[PDB]
């Protein structure tokens, strides 16, 4: 099945600094990816569904980008709430694979 | 559940009710009558107050009368 | 609001049978399909299984295939992830998520499972 | 499949322009009355889009 990994390593940018993670699919899943934000000891929160369109109840700073295999997420400004481990899942296949994840720290 | 909300015998009010392509048209005129027993013979033209895109077919109508 | 809660996760002996419960409230459980996910400690997430809205059709992950069973009751508004032949690798925090990967997606708080 | 979208597979008559039918009543394709319950030759009018 499709395998999802996140290329960037842990980034310790400070509050108010723009950050960008990259998620790469093994094979083309079209626009079927879901970006998540999981705080430790907390349920994951889906940042962007598919591509471009932000999920409801998610702050405007989070953005959805990338078509085909390549997918990307950009945060305009950092905050204490924002720091977390982010994960991306392919939705094109029937079995679902989740991204390795990138840690975000102050 | 209401698509449209409106916040605003000696009287005769005339209404034409039609449904066409899912649009309900009401033509309303307001002309005073003189004879209590029945409206005196006259010619009037009804001007449409508003058009509502209800889409629901209308097969029947009923009136509402206040009772003391 | 959509509310998801998880239960039935606890320490289990290897090879033991442990069954989870996915609480559903604030939405029509029957209409929506349900997915199961698990999070291994210091690892990425791993989707476990999916059950359909009616429960007729179900798929399973390659790692847990023929070992983990998923069931649901429409009247009880709960999805049960039965786990058998449990292993030390299987140890994870299990998250039950409805309509994964879409706008409808919601995530449960989760219950820790240890083996 | 997305149960969010359903299309009217069976209707007694063709809809007129800009007319909406939301009725969920069982379709009496068969001569025998459906009686408001599922039966042979009786199918739900709405077929969920897959």
List the subunits that have 3+ CB pairs under 8 angstroms with C: A, D
Q: Which of D4, D5, D48 to mutate to test the interface with C (most CBs of C within 10 A)?
A: D4
B47/D contact by beta carbon, under 8 A: no
- Measured between beta carbons, the chain C residues lying within 8 angstroms of A43 are 95, 107-110
C95 vs A98: CB contact, 8 Å cut-off? no
The number of C-beta contacts closer than 8 angstroms across A and C is 64
How many interface pairs between B and D have CB atoms less than 8 angstroms apart? 15
Question: Residue B24: beta bridge partners?
Answer: B19, B52
- Cβ distance D17 to B22 less than 8 Å, yes or no, reads yes
Would the CA dihedral through A61, A22, A24, A66 be positive or negative?
Answer: positive
Reported resolution in A? 2.6
Q: Which helix (H) or strand (E) holds B55?
A: none
Which A residues 56-85 touch C at CB under 8 Å? 56
Number of residues that this document lists for chain C: 115
Pairing status of strand B47-52 against strand B23-32? antiparallel
Residue C8 CB neighbour total at 10 angstroms: 17
CA distances from C51 to A30, B15, C57, C89 (A): 24, 57, 6, 23
Sign of the four-CA dihedral C41, C45, C48, C49 = positive
For C85, other C-beta atoms within 10 Å of its C-beta total 13
Which string of b and e fits C66-78 if b means at least 16 CB within 10 Å?
eebbbebeeeeeb
CA geometry: angle A101, C4, C34, nearest 5 deg: 75
Name which of C82, C66, C71, C81 is nearest C16 in CA terms.
Answer: C82
Kindly tell me the burial class for residue A47, based on how many C-beta atoms sit within 10 Å of its own C-beta (0-12, 13-18, 19 or more).
buried
**With the C-alpha atoms ordered A40, A44, A47, A51, is the resulting torsion angle positive or negative?**
positive
How far is residue B37's CA from residue B39's CA, in Å, rounded to a whole number?
7
Element (H, E) at C79: strand C78-83
């Amino acid at each position: 099945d499709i395998q999802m990994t996140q290329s960037p390593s842990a980034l310790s940018a400070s509050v108010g600094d723009r950050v960008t993670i990259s998620c790469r699919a093994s094979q083309n899943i079209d626009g079927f990816l879901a970006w998540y934000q999981q705080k430790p000891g907390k349920a994951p929160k889906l940042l962007i569904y598919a591509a471009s369109r932000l999920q409801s109840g998610i702050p405007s700073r989070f953005s959805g980008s990338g078509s085909g295999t390549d997918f990307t997420l950009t945060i305009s400004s950092l905050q204490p709430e924002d720091f977390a481990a982010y994960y991306c899942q392919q939705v094109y296949s029937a079995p679902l694979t989740f991204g390795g994840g990138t840690k975000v720290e102050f | 559940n209401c698509t449209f909300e409106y916040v605003s015998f000696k009287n005769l009010r005339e209404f034409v009710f039609k449904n066409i392509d899912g649009y309900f048209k009401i033509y309303s005129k307001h002309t005073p009558i003189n004879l209590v027993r029945d409206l005196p013979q006259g010619f009037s033209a009804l001007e449409p107050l508003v058009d509502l895109p209800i889409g629901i077919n209308i097969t029947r109508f009923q009136t509402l009368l206040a009772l003391h | 609001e959509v509310q998801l809660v998880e239960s039935g996760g606890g320490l289990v002996q290897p090879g033991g049978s442990l069954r989870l419960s996915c609480t559903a409230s604030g939405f029509t459980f029957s209409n929506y399909g349900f997915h199961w996910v698990r999070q291994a400690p210091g690892k990425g997430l791993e989707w476990v299984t999916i059950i359909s809205y009616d429960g007729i059709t179900k798929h399973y992950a390659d790692s847990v295939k023929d070992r983990f069973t998923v069931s649901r009751d429409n009247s009880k508004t709960m999805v049960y992830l039965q786990m058998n032949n449990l292993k030390l690798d299987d140890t994870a925090v299990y998250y039950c998520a409805r309509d994964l990967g879409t706008y409808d997606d919601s995530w449960g708080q989760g219950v820790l499972v240890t083996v | 499949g997305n149960y969010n979208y359903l299309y009217r597979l069976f209707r007694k008559s063709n809809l007129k322009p800009f007319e909406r039918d939301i009725s969920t009543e069982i379709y009496q394709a068969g001569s025998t009355p459906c009686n408001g319950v599922e039966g042979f030759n009786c199918y739900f009018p709405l077929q969920s889009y897959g």
